Amino acid sequence: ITYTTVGELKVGSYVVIDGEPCRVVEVTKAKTGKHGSAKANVVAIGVFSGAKKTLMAPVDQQVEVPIIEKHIGQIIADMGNKIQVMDLESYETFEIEKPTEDELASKIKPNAELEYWEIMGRRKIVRVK
């Protein structure tokens, strides 16, 4: 939960909105005047939920950034809906949910090397080798 300001956000940055970490996909600026100070509207996609989240705030407003904590691991079981992963560093074999994405739900096999990120207390698979 590191901190920055809304004006510092750009496309590709990460930010917490409604409690969920999100990846910024659009930033629109608005000039000063009747509403108040200069403002930015950020459009972001929830990393877990996938939902579109927007935030309109003054450029100096403080926002929370999640920390990515990227890891690389491997799968032992298949278990159907749940998957048992082995982190390359530190063992710590754990259970997570299959990626419901198209490109990741295929290429799944026993002893397949994957890359999973750990953000705010919840892990997510991104790629598979």
Binding site: T28, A30, G33, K34, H35, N41, V43, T54, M56
Partner: protein, 312 residues
Amino acid sequence: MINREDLLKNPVEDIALRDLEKYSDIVNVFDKIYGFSSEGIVRGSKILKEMIKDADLRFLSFTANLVSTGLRGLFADLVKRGYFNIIVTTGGTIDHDLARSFGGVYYKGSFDIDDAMLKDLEIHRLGNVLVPFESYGKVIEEIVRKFLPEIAKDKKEIPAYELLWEFGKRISDSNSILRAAYEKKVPVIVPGIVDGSFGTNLFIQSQFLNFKINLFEDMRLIKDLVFSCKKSGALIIGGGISKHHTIWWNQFKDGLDYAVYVTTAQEYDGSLSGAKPREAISWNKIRPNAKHATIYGDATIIVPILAASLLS
């Protein structure tokens, strides 16, 4: 005396753009005359046509009283045919559209009839339109009591625009504004939603359901549409909260790129309702190089003239 069935003889009839087709050249008559409103009509019809071409966010902002006239079917037609894709209006619009969509018949009346006679006969007068008691408040109360429990079970805290789609979902009247907006996923932004029969009946049922409204989500929607659009336009009929709210949110994109205002209010009393386009420059809710036009006149006369011009 005069009995009820004498007064409630001829229902108000909704019109559509098809009724105006044979008068699509009428602006040429006023262009030739060029008396004091003809410039506003000629420029307004041109600004409307350019807005349909170059503006991807097109506002239809209007006051409630229009929806008791035959103009209700016109606004549903304009939404159905894609001319406008966001609506900013008042709680009175919801009352009238809901009442007339669920069996409530409005009747042609007169300004010159005894109003005390109506209260005895259980008839509301709005302009020279007669609204029988059982056609307005009975219908809206029944509809909300019937459909809110299912809606509230699905979503206990709901944006007002989604709530209006849910009631638009259950409408079968093809002249209905709420039905047209829901069929096209056109948001209906009503900041003053708690004002009126619909809002009062929402509150009554909220005593019995775990149900709440979150107008911060209606604010988020109109804010997001204004920020993410390229150009914006508006046909703004009347004044009040629905005019100010439309103009207010467009300030975040340096104002409406196109705007046509139809009003009767004047400027000398300092009201927002009678504020000219040479008033929103100070509030920077109009672009420095923008096409705006104001027509002073009765909407039931000016609007059919402008809308017919859309078929020229």
